[PDB]
């Protein structure tokens, strides 16, 4: 399909689930049971970019919503954010760079590195209920790896 995608969920290595904070923010937290359905279902798109056997470019939008994770400089610092797009032109095979993440297969875990800002990754905090953000450091206080779960569509 011109642009191929797949629906899925992500979970941090701490087993925290992602949910929508505001209209433009994601937060991570320990969730179980009935609460689990509050989690966000992404729609991962396989876009065009520099490819490898362990490094695939993707775009992460929300299922059925014209919102995409985007990387931008905000206050002279790489920043993660949800961005609105024309429901009619997206997704597309050739997404803009700010929308592109390199999906990296590590342990049996994943990492999402910004195509735009090398070595900047999608991260979560150890703490509960904090926002998902773009962190510039690996192997640290912050969490950079996740696992993914496929969902039926």
UniProtKB/Swiss-Prot annotation:
Main location: cytoplasm
Induction description: By LPS. Transcription and translation induced by M.tuberculosis and a number of different M.tuberculosis components in macrophages; EsxA is the most potent activator tested (at protein level). In pancreatic islets, release is increased by high glucose treatment. In pancreatic islets and macrophages, release is also increased by endocannabinoid anandamide/AEA.
Keywords attached to this entry: Cytokine, Cytoplasm, Inflammatory response, Lysosome, Mitogen, Pyrogen, Secreted
Tissue expression profile of the protein: Expressed in activated monocytes/macrophages (at protein level).
Keyword NADP: no
Result after altering residue 128 to K: Increased affinity for integrin ITGAV:ITGB3. Suppression of integrin binding. Suppression of integrin binding
GO BP field: apoptotic process; astrocyte activation; cell-cell signaling; cellular response to interleukin-17; cellular response to lipopolysaccharide; cellular response to mechanical stimulus; cellular response to xenobiotic stimulus; cytokine-mediated signaling pathway
Gene Ontology MF term list: cytokine activity; integrin binding; interleukin-1 receptor binding; protein domain specific binding
Site positions per UniProt: Involved in receptor binding: 4
Motif (Involved in interaction with TMED10 C-terminus): 112-125
Gene Ontology, cellular component aspect: cytosol; extracellular region; extracellular space; lysosome; secretory granule
Site feature (Important for interaction with integrin) residues: 55, 63, 65, 74, 88
Modulation of this protein's activity: (Microbial infection) Cleavage by S.pyogenes cysteine protease SpeB promotes its activation independently of CASP1. SpeB-mediated maturation of IL1B plays a dual role depending on infection site: while IL1B inflammatory response prevents bacterial growth during invasive skin infections, it promotes streptococcal infection of the nasopharynx by disrupting colonization resistance mediated by the microbiota.
Modification after translation (UniProt): Activation of the IL1B precursor involves a CASP1-catalyzed proteolytic cleavage. Processing and secretion are temporarily associated. (Microbial infection) Cleavage by S.pyogenes cysteine protease SpeB promotes its activation independently of CASP1.
Localization of this protein: Cytoplasm, Cytosol; Secreted; Lysosome; Secreted, Extracellular exosome
Function: Potent pro-inflammatory cytokine. Initially discovered as the major endogenous pyrogen, induces prostaglandin synthesis, neutrophil influx and activation, T-cell activation and cytokine production, B-cell activation and antibody production, and fibroblast proliferation and collagen production. Promotes Th17 differentiation of T-cells. Synergizes with IL12/interleukin-12 to induce IFNG synthesis from T-helper 1 (Th1) cells. Plays a role in angiogenesis by inducing VEGF production synergistically with TNF and IL6.
Family (UniProt): Belongs to the IL-1 family.
Subunit: Monomer. In its precursor form, weakly interacts with full-length MEFV; the mature cytokine does not interact at all. Interacts with integrins ITGAV:ITGBV and ITGA5:ITGB1; integrin-binding is required for IL1B signaling. Interacts with cargo receptor TMED10; the interaction is direct and is required for the secretion of IL1B mature form. Interacts with HSP90AB1; the interaction facilitates cargo translocation into the ERGIC. Interacts with HSP90B1; the interaction facilitates cargo translocation into the ERGIC.
Miscellaneous information on this protein: The IL1B production occurs in 2 steps, each being controlled by different stimuli. First, inflammatory signals, such as LPS, stimulate the synthesis and promote the accumulation of cytosolic stores of pro-IL1B (priming). Then additional signals are required for inflammasome assembly, leading to CASP1 activation, pro-IL1B processing and eventually secretion of the active cytokine. IL1B processing and secretion are temporarily associated.
Protein name: Interleukin-1 beta
Organism: Homo sapiens
Classification of source organism: Eukaryota, Metazoa, Chordata, Craniata, Vertebrata
Gene giving rise to this polypeptide: IL1B
């Amino acid at each position: 399909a011109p642009v191929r995608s797949l629906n899925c969920t992500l979970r941090d290595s701490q087993q925290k689930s992602l949910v929508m904070s505001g209209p433009y923010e994601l937060k991570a937290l320990h969730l179980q049971g009935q609460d689990m359905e509050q989690q966000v279902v992404f729609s991962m798109s396989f876009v065009q970019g520099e490819e490898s056997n362990d490094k695939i470019p993707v775009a992460l939008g929300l299922k059925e919503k014209n919102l995409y994770l985007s990387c931008v400089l905000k206050d002279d610092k790489p920043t993660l954010q949800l961005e609105s797009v024309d429901p009619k032109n997206y997704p597309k095979k050739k997404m803009e760079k700010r929308f592109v993440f390199n999906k990296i297969e590590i342990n049996n875990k994943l990492e999402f590195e910004s195509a735009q800002f090398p070595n900047w990754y999608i991260s979560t905090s150890q703490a509960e209920n904090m926002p998902v953000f773009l962190g510039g450091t690996k192997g640290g206080q912050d969490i950079t790896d996740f696992t993914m779960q496929f969902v039926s569509s």
